[PDB]
Amino acid sequence: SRKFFVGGNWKMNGRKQSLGELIGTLNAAKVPADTEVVCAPPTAYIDFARQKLDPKIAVAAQNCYKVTNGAFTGEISPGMIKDCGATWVVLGHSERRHVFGESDELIGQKVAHALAEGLGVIACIGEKLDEREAGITEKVVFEQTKVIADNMKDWSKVVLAYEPVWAIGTGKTATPQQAQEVHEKLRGWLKSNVSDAVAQSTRIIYGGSVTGATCKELASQPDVDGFLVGGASLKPEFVDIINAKQ
Amino acid sequence: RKFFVGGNWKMNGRKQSLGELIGTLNAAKVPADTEVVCAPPTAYIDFARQKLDPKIAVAAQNCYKVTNGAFTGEISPGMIKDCGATWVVLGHSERRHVFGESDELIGQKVAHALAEGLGVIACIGEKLDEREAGITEKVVFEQTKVIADNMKDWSKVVLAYEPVWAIGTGKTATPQQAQEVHEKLRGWLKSNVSDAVAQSTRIIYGGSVTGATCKELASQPDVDGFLVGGASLKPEFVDIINAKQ
């Protein structure tokens, strides 16, 4: 019985005043008890957000590096994330992979280390438009998921996020049925390559375009276990997406 | 040119350990002729500014080139200002050589940070292969050039020379080898920008500095301070603050 999971990726948006407002909205919101809600602030505001947010909402970092301390100007470690009261980290996000060039190997290593330090991990995967139009969706997301899997001792604190990069900013839209086709193929990969236990208990959430209007239909897909929300996570509309199963 | 001592904590510390360091720094007597800046890890910019006495300025360790946007894991100069920090380090050797940040990207970041009202510590330097091939000047001049082309105003910039060729290589820089590069960089400012920019721009040294070495390095005519690494996490940093005393 996989617990429904809604992530809010704020990305590089907001200041203390505006995020303070957003947080007041989320605190005033009724969160269903059967739903796990997580918010990822810009790294400068992880501490700030954890202090202001009600305990019913967990806090994620948006990225981290692969050792606990070191000569890595501009990076943060999982220890720092935990030290700030955050319990999750988002890793392998399409923007890290495709804007900032983070390799599969680097990401697998980040997952191992964040997991070894006690954080949950939202591990992101997905294919670009050129990869999808070349017919290599499965090949790409399976390879990304394999590299993550090779750097794991334990699956219980991982959530997989499928991002259709091919449908973010390109003009193309993704159907609920296309999302479901990728999600069930990823679950089938977990069953045949890790275990049926992992396949049946691991949340696979959809990180493509989600709104107050699209969320109910997407969430009723049997292999779509929730959402990693982009722009809408900055709006009160997020509260509708939290309630997508209601 | 006011003497400038920067402390780059890198990816080190927690609230407890950094709170302790900050107590130590808050007890230090900062000379009137010296500008002190500390760069915490990004998760602790806010924490550090709240705990530090105002006689010490706070810097971000990196930032991005737009004020808000779809850039998971980044921070903007707006957020840095919002947390009470007045500087950012850009083009650090680690951003360049571990994380692949290009000259063009760094230039764009410099322009955006200066425009949003931050000071910028702009880092340049050559690797060992480049030094031993004889292209020290080519590499550092190119890096300073691409930056200069993305800037109009020089008053809020500090140039940091990093002898990357001395990090974990088995080679080290002498004070004289540091002076030599600082002099050539001031030379490039004269010839490529102006004499005025060349006479007023702090050029600080970003290689190994300790309490034992700091006074000899600071006495070099073209070395105007430091961007300190490992020693910045220790009381020894307070002695490096006193380098020109």
UniProtKB/Swiss-Prot annotation, chain B:
The modification N6-succinyllysine is found at K145, K152, K190. The active site is at H92 (electrophile), E162 (proton acceptor). The modification 3'-nitrotyrosine is found at Y64, Y205. Changing F237L: In TPID; Hungary; thermolabile. InterPro entries: Aldolase_TIM, TIM_sf, TrioseP_Isoase_bac/euk, Triosephosphate_isomerase, Triosephosphate_isomerase_AS. Keywords: Acetylation, Cytoplasm, Disease variant, Gluconeogenesis, Glycolysis, Hereditary hemolytic anemia, Isomerase, Isopeptide bond, Lyase, Methylation, Nitration, Phosphoprotein, Ubl conjugation. Pathway: Carbohydrate degradation; glycolysis; D-glyceraldehyde 3-phosphate from glycerone phosphate: step 1/1; Carbohydrate biosynthesis; gluconeogenesis. The modification N6-acetyllysine is found at K10, K152, K190, K234. GO terms for biological process: canonical glycolysis; gluconeogenesis; glyceraldehyde-3-phosphate biosynthetic process; glycerol catabolic process; glycolytic process; methylglyoxal biosynthetic process. Belongs to the triosephosphate isomerase family. This is Triosephosphate isomerase. It comes from Homo sapiens.
